[PDB]
From a paper:
The histone H3K36-specific methyltransferase ASH1L plays a critical role in development and is frequently dysregulated in human diseases, particularly cancer. ASH1L itself functions as a specific methyltransferase: it methylates lysine 36 of histone H3 producing mono- and di-methylated epigenetic marks H3K36me1/214,15. There is no information available about the N-terminal 2,000 amino acids of ASH1L, though several domains have been identified in the C-terminal part, which contains the catalytic SET (Su(var), E(z), Trithorax) domain, followed by a bromodomain (BD), a plant homeodomain (PHD) finger and a bromo-adjacent homology (BAH) domain. We find that ASH1LPHD recognizes H3K4me2/3, whereas the neighboring ASH1LBD and ASH1LBAH have DNA binding activities.
To gain insight into the molecular mechanism of the recognition of H3K4me3/2, we co-crystallized ASH1LPHD with H3K4me3 and H3K4me2 peptides and determined a 1.3 Å resolution crystal structure of the ASH1LPHD:H3K4me3 complex and a 1.9 Å resolution crystal structure of the ASH1LPHD:H3K4me2 complex. The H3K4me3 peptide occupies an extended, shallow, negatively charged binding site of the domain. Backbone chains of histone residues R2-K4me3 pair with the existing β-sheet of ASH1LPHD, forming the third anti-parallel β-strand, and the side chains of the peptide residues make additional intermolecular contacts. W2608 makes a cation–π contact with the trimethylammonium group of K4 and is critical for structural stability of ASH1LPHD, as mutation of W2608 to alanine disrupts the protein fold. The D2595K mutant lost the ability to interact with H3K4me3, likely due to the electrostatic repulsion of the positively charged K4me3 group. The structure of the ASH1LPHD-H3K4me3 complex overlays well with the structure of the ASH1LPHD-H3K4me2 complex (rmsd of 0.1 Å), as well as with the structure of the ING2PHD-H3K4me3 complex (rmsd of 1 Å), pointing to a conserved mode of the methyllysine recognition.
Residue numbers in the entry:
A (entry chain A), B (entry chain B): 1 to 53
C (entry chain T), D (entry chain P): 1 to 12
Write the structure that this text describes.
Amino acid sequence: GPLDVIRCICGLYKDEGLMIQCDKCMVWQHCDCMGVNSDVEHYLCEQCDPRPV
Amino acid sequence: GPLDVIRCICGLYKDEGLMIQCDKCMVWQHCDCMGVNSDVEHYLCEQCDPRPV
Amino acid sequence: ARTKQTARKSTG
Amino acid sequence: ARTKQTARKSTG
Ligand SMILES: [Zn+2]
Ligand SMILES: [Zn+2]
Ligand SMILES: [Zn+2]
Ligand SMILES: [Zn+2]
């Protein structure tokens, strides 16, 4: 909702599919765009933890 | 810094120039991309307050 | 980690 | 509104 921030590598501000929250900065990202699923124990976005995606 | 979220309409995750924070969702945006400056009393981003930019 | 799926398909 | 400019150019 309004208080939740979507900031995925795709740059599309849309709530779609399985989404995952960065543990530190709290943005939401699409699991499919980031290559993860709900099985990971912890998650950081690509700005908090720079890496190829 | 790492705890500050940049989410501008330009989609570039870069700390450059005068930047302004959304009063509600707390993202930072480039004043030049959004058409504002430090003179405004309050500010909402384009997702909190959708509008042509 | 915290996940969500707002419009998830249900079998019900 | 809260604003910032991290690398602002100065006269000094
Ligand atoms: Zn995405
Ligand atoms: Zn993050
Ligand atoms: Zn911008
Ligand atoms: Zn906002």
